[PDB]
Each structure stands twice: as structure tokens, then as C-alpha cells.
Design a protein around this ligand. Structure first.
Ligand SMILES: N[C@@H](CCC(=O)N[C@@H](CS)C(=O)NCC(=O)O)C(=O)O
Ligand SMILES: N[C@@H](CCC(=O)N[C@@H](CS)C(=O)NCC(=O)O)C(=O)O
Ligand SMILES: [Mg+2]
Lengths: 198, 198
């Protein structure tokens, strides 16, 4: 089928979709719009938000809903229904935290303060719960990589931009990132993708 | 299987699970804890949040992950993988919005300010997007009820508590709420459930 992903020129919420396409070796149009075209693009979105993924003429929206759709019947989904639930749960827990940041906050002064408070007073609790959850296991769910691992690597990459020492107390979570970054197809995408801050 | 749902004494985030159980005619323990006992239970949870669902001893978390698990392979999921994606997307759009409200904000000043902002400016836009998405169809996705319809009913019920005129310009969205409440199993639950504000 023909796929067309539309998002801004940044990793952000479209990156999980881009990782999945890379991993599954599926061709797609990576459409990155500029701020100047937002007004026009927006008037075509079902709920005024991106990313959207057009599949053979039909529009899908919501990054995680799209990620789940693309991984259905693949090795990234989770081996059992219980495990698939755990994958969804970990992704939503991560997404819940990322959604707490004031990404659209105009006033930089207030924005910086909130980011710093979230990374100092809240992040540590989530990092510890994730580390405890993973224990000595190779991956977050099951005995093989799932898109939950992809999401951890993606979210942590952005958090590290604002809090470099985020994982200084959790080497096991760093190892996990490295294992994700070591997957051949993923490594290739990470090396070739457009370099953006977020 | 043996199901035990744990949450606070309110509809909130556990209600979608309660609707699914009622619709599917599944018995479960509806455990509603007291604030005074939350800090004790919280310490035993991998991620310290509720609702959680114990399935034959195994614990699951994240309301939507659990809802998806329960509806898999049932008539409440979409009829195709694409339709299943639409269901997931609608639920996430609604959840994203409801999650924007500062429910735990102690500062009545900031809390009231954000509630008014969300209800006065954002809500109308979402309502218009939803009405347009629904069009003249009976349900949000496909030709039959899905858990996305349940979620609309649940979400709008709480929104209507703070903004009763929410749907005065959207009769079709009111009718959808009524269509869901009319389903025998749901109507039975609605009339039997604990009467709470949220
Ligand atoms: N939870 C949604 C997020 C939707 C969202 O807020 N997208 C942002 C881009 S990162 C956007 O479209 N913003 C436009 C706006 O805020 O009006 C997803 O994962 O797709
Ligand atoms: N996004 C999670 C909700 C996590 C959450 O914030 N739950 C609230 C109850 S509505 C709770 O656990 N708050 C008590 C606390 O965080 O200590 C889900 O959908 O289950
Ligand atoms: Mg979410």
C-alpha cells in the first residue's frame, strides 16, 4: 500500500512511526512541512493535529494508534495478548510523562522553569519505576524487542537533551537504549535522518 | 476469568473498563478504595497509578491499555485493522483532551483558570471536529458500536458537569450519547452504578 506520513521536520511524535517503517523495511513518503504551510495542512487534518498517516487514500491519525496499527501481526507487537497489553501500558506511561511538558509554552522563562522542575522532581521517580520494571531482563516486554523499547529510546533521547544526567543512576536503562540503537535497520535510520533538536 | 478492578470511588478513568465489562456481561470485583488507603496501595504498584486490573492474579495497568485488552476479539473492536486504528485514535484524541484538565491541581486559582480556558476555547473546537468526523453516521467507527462510542459517552458526561451547554450546537453528538445509554447492558449499569460527581 502507499504510505504518506505528514509531520513537522523533527523527531517528535512521528519518530516512533519512522522507526517502525525502518525496522520493517517498508517504503513510505516522509513528508515534513514548514511552519509557513501549517494553516493549509491543518485544514485537512481530522482533529487539527499531526502526525497523520495516509494509507491508500485514507487518513489515520494519533501517533500511537498508528504505531499499533503498523506493528500488528509483526514481531514488534508482543508475543501474547497479555504482553501486548503491557507494551501498550508502557508506551502510554511514557507518553503520559512526555505530555506533561509545556512544549508550546510561549514564555521561555516559565517554560524553562517547568521543564527543569519536571526533570528534577518527577523524572527520577519514573526512571526508577522503569528501571525496576526492566530488572535484569534484555527488553521491556518478552524475550525480544517490541515497539515499547523503541519508544523508550525515542523519549529518553529527547529527555537527555534537557537533562544529560537523566540516566546516571540507571545504567540498565542506558544499555537498553544502546541495544535499540544497535539494531541494524534502526542504526541506519538514526544515522541518515535529518538532524533536529527535537 | 477472575477480574478485580481497583480505582477510586468515581467514574473517572476506570469507567471505560466498567462499561466494557457490563456490555460483555462479564462479572468482576469493582474495588473502590479510600483516599486514606491509597498511599499504602500505591507503594505496591509498579508505576503507582490506578486504575489497575488483576486478571487471574496477573496485574495490568493504564486504563486504555486494559480496555483494548478486554475488547480484543470482541464486537467492540473495529471490524478491520484500519477501523481498529480509527477506534484507538478517537479514544486517544478524547483522552488527550480530558488529560489537559488539571484534575489534581490544588491551586484553585490556576485550576479554575485552565478549566475555563479549556471549556471556553478548546472544547468547542473539539466538538466541531467530532461532529464533522461523525457526520450523519450512527456510530463513530463502522456500522456498529465500538468502545470509542462508550468513551465519548463517558468523556462528555464529565464535560457536561462543568459546561452543560457543551453540545447545544451539536444535536448529532447528543444523539450518539443517547444511543450508547440506550444499549440495555449499559443502561442497566448506568442506573445501578454509584452516584458520584466525576
Ligand atoms: N497525542 C497526539 C498528539 C497530537 C498533537 O498534539 N500533535 C501536535 C504536534 S507534536 C500538533 O499537531 N500540534 C498542533 C496544535 O497544537 O494545534 C499524537 O500522538 O499524535
Ligand atoms: N493515564 C493513566 C492514569 C494514571 C493516573 O494519573 N491515575 C490517577 C487516577 S485518575 C492516579 O493514579 N492518581 C493518584 C496518584 O498519582 O498518586 C490511565 O489511563 O490509567
Ligand atoms: Mg495517551
Amino acid at each position: 500500500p502507499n504510505y504518506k506520513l505528514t509531520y513537522f521536520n523533527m523527531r517528535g511524535r512521528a519518530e516512533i512511526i519512522r522507526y517502525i517503517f525502518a525496522y520493517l523495511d517498508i517504503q513510505y513518503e516522509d513528508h515534513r512541512i514548514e511552519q509557513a504551510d501549517w494553516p493549509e495542512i491543518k485544514s485537512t487534518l481530522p482533529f487539527g493535529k499531526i502526525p497523520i498517516l495516509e494509507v491508500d487514500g485514507l487518513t489515520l491519525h494519533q501517533s500511537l494508534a498508528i504505531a499499533r496499527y503498523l506493528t500488528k501481526n509483526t514481531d514488534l507487537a508482543g508475543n501474547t495478548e497479555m504482553e501486548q497489553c503491557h507494551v501498550d501500558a508502557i508506551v502510554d506511561t511514557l507518553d503520559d510523562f512526555m505530555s506533561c511538558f509545556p512544549w508550546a509554552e510561549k514564555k521561555q522563562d516559565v517554560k524553562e522553569q517547568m521543564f527543569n522542575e519536571l526533570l528534577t522532581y518527577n523524572a527520577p521517580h519514573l526512571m526508577q519505576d522503569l528501571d525496576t520494571y526492566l530488572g535484569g531482563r534484555e527488553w521491556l516486554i518478552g524475550m525480544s524487542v517490541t515497539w515499547a523499547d523503541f519508544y523508550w529510546e525515542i523519549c529518553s533521547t529527547t529527555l537527555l537533551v534537557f537533562k544529560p544526567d537523566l540516566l546516571d543512576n540507571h545504567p540498565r536503562l542506558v544499555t537498553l537504549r544502546k541495544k535499540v540503537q544497535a539494531i541494524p535497520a534502526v542504526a541506519n535510520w538514526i544515522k541518515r535522518r535529518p538532524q533536529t533538536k527535537l
